[PDB]
């Protein structure tokens, strides 16, 4: 009875559920948990869909069969849910296939919408310049409006909705590469529930067309004002980056880890700052990312401004005697400490200013999570960053160290939640981040669970000293 006691206690949450499901070899437990999933809140379980489905694919049939009923149940009440299942099932096997086919058996509008977006991106390979690509993109996106509005949505959106319109003149291609990703803006009308409503009616259309470097709210204004649907209160603007030829599965894994660390740090009371950005896996090949707006790469901030990072801070926020500056500095210091910790724990590599974004309030945001964990430069603290923090002798810089210690102590207290996420994903995985022999073992070592706090203080110093040598 002691086990069943626990399962019926307050301590039982979806995490514990998944853990037992993953570990227990008892079919009675598997079935018991399979049934208890229905009792949990959708949102809580949703976060773990990749884990559940990975287990389903790569684990013993008993484990799959305990999971399936719940999945099918969710699939029947939400086509969004159906979609993500079908997309994930396919992506994570290259067992899955039988159920995927059954779920796809309706969704054609969405799947064709996505196919076309993917198809567009693949065509731009023949245009060797960014600017030429952008021209063809814009033209080709306008053709999508001929099919809108439809039973189509962006899974990356916080809410239920219908897609009505694509402001094609606003779309842009992000590099000159062969399989370049491209950023688009999408218009939508919010729902309270998708599955039982609308598909709104077309409004035929006709300055708003011109595209330039401007803040997010100024861009919404311009697009809205030009849009047929812009008058409605129901109307909102979304954005996605479309990656037609890039795997996003590590990117998804990192997201979960970032999201967990973020909760961990909110629950303990450490004001580190980070920004998980949503991921949508579409195939092993392809997916989408929801971008952070009002942010641009550090590198390009220095190429268009011709300034030093600090000089740019001073230009964009004010003199160091201003509130706006001191606030931005704080966001800098808090976002740096956050991301340092993420980089260390996940062993994030390939770190350079093309991969670090700066938002309009002063937070930095790290971005290219190829090269994490076992996959094989590390996170650096350049003097340019130290300058923005007010220097080595600075109080804000000491505070950066303080935060790092605090966030580490916090992380250790909730380590299992983090490790869980990675370890279940490793299962049948041929992802480069699991190439090594000791991925999870090394991950745990990096939490330094044996250490006394005095020891951790030292480790933080060593870490920081290390971050500066280069």
């Amino acid at each position: 009875s002691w086990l069943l006691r626990l399962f019926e206690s307050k301590l039982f949450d979806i995490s514990m559920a998944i853990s037992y499901l993953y570990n227990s070899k008892e079919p009675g437990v598997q079935a018991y948990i399979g049934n208890r999933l229905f009792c949990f809140r959708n949102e809580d379980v949703d976060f773990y869909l990749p884990q559940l489905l990975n287990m389903y694919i790569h684990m013993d049939e008993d484990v799959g069969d305990a999971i399936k009923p719940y999945i099918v149940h969710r699939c029947r009440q939400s086509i969004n849910f159906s979609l993500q299942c079908a997309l994930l099932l396919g992506a994570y096997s290259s067992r899955g296939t039988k159920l995927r086919k059954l779920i796809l058996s309706r969704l054609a509008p969405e799947r064709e919408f996505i196919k076309s977006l993917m198809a567009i991106g693949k065509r731009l390979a023949t245009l060797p310049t960014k600017e030429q690509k952008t021209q063809r993109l814009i033209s080709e996106l306008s053709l999508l409006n001929h099919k809108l509005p439809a039973r189509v949505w962006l899974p990356t959106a916080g809410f239920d909705h219908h897609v009505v319109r694509v402001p094609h003149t606003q779309a842009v291609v992000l590099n000159s590469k062969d399989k370049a990703p491209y950023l688009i803006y999408v218009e939508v009308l919010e729902c309270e529930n998708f599955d039982t409503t609308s598909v709104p009616a077309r409004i035929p259309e006709n300055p708003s067309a011109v595209a330039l470097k401007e803040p997010w709210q100024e861009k919404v204004r311009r697009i809205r004002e030009g849009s047929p649907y812009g008058h409605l209160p129901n109307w909102r603007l979304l954005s996605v980056i479309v990656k037609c030829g890039d795997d996003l599965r590590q990117e998804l894994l990192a997201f979960q880890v970032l999201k967990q660390l973020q909760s961990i740090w909110e629950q303990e009371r450490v004001p580190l700052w980070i920004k998980p950005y949503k991921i949508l896996v579409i195939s092993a090949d392809s997916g989408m990312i929801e971008p952070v707006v009002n942010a641009v790469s550090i590198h390009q901030v220095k190429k268009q401004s011709q300034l030093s990072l600090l000089d740019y801070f001073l230009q964009e926020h004010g003199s160091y005697t201003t509130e706006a500056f001191l606030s931005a500095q704080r966001n800098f210091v808090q976002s740096c400490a956050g991301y340092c910790l993420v980089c260390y724990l996940l062993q994030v590599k390939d770190r350079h200013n093309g991969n670090i974004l700066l938002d309009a309030e002063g937070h930095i945001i790290h971005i290219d999570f190829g090269f994490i964990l076992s996959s094989s430069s590390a996170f650096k603290l350049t003097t340019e960053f130290v300058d923005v923090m007010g220097g080595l002798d600075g109080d804000m810089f000491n505070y950066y160290k303080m935060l790092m210690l605090q966030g580490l102590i916090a992380a250790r207290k909730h380590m299992d939640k983090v490790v869980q996420i990675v370890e279940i994903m490793q299962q049948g995985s041929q992802l480069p981040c699991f190439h090594g022999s000791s991925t999870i073992r090394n991950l745990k070592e990096r939490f330094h669970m044996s250490m006394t706090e005095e020891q951790l203080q030292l480790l933080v110093e060593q870490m920081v000293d290390g971050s500066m040598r280069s």
Binding site: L3, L4, E26, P27, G28, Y32, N35, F38
Partner: protein, 173 residues
């Protein structure tokens, strides 16, 4: 002290359906998720009163695995009652109830009282055998029927107490 009757009852069914926990629930009010396959046979006893008479029931928990099915059938001998159990959440286990009753018309008294038991009623959302279909089959073949959860303990007492009572008044005249 003294019983008026000693009723020998067997629990049979596919491996995994919950026989051993029906028994542990019924005789010591205990249940467990973690399980050890029943090797051959297990014994437990409990006394009840029906229509004023103390009846001691001797229950033999048989084991559904086939490795042991030569030696379980030994104990079918002279048993007055049999709980034939299936798992509500695993359809195959219900499918085999027909072969489990032929198993009584080869190694056991031809005039025995049977109750069909759908166990694990607590797994609502995993249900693979509808209550109506089962109870239909139950009386087409002259069997009494009930659904239990050894886990939450629903109907476990009732199940036993029903079959023992049913038995106790076949005997009279």
């Amino acid at each position: 002290d003294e019983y008026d009757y000693l009723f020998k009852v067997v629990l049979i069914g596919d491996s995994g359906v919950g026989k051993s926990n029906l028994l542990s629930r019924f005789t010591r009010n205990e249940f467990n998720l973690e399980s050890k396959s029943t090797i051959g046979v297990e014994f437990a006893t409990r006394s009840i009163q029906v229509d004023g008479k103390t009846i001691k029931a001797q229950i033999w928990d048989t084991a559904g695995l086939e490795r042991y099915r030569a030696i379980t059938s030994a104990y079918y001998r002279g048993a007055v009652g049999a709980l034939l159990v299936y798992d509500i959440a695993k359809h195959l286990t219900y499918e085999n109830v027909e072969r489990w009753l032929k198993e009584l018309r080869d190694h056991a008294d031809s005039n025995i009282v049977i109750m069909l038991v759908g166990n694990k009623s607590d797994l609502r959302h995993l249900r693979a055998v509808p209550t109506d279909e089962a109870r239909a089959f139950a009386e087409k073949n002259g069997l009494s029927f009930i659904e239990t959860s050894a886990l939450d303990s629903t109907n476990v007492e009732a199940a036993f107490q029903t079959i023992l009572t049913e038995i106790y008044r076949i005997v009279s005249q």
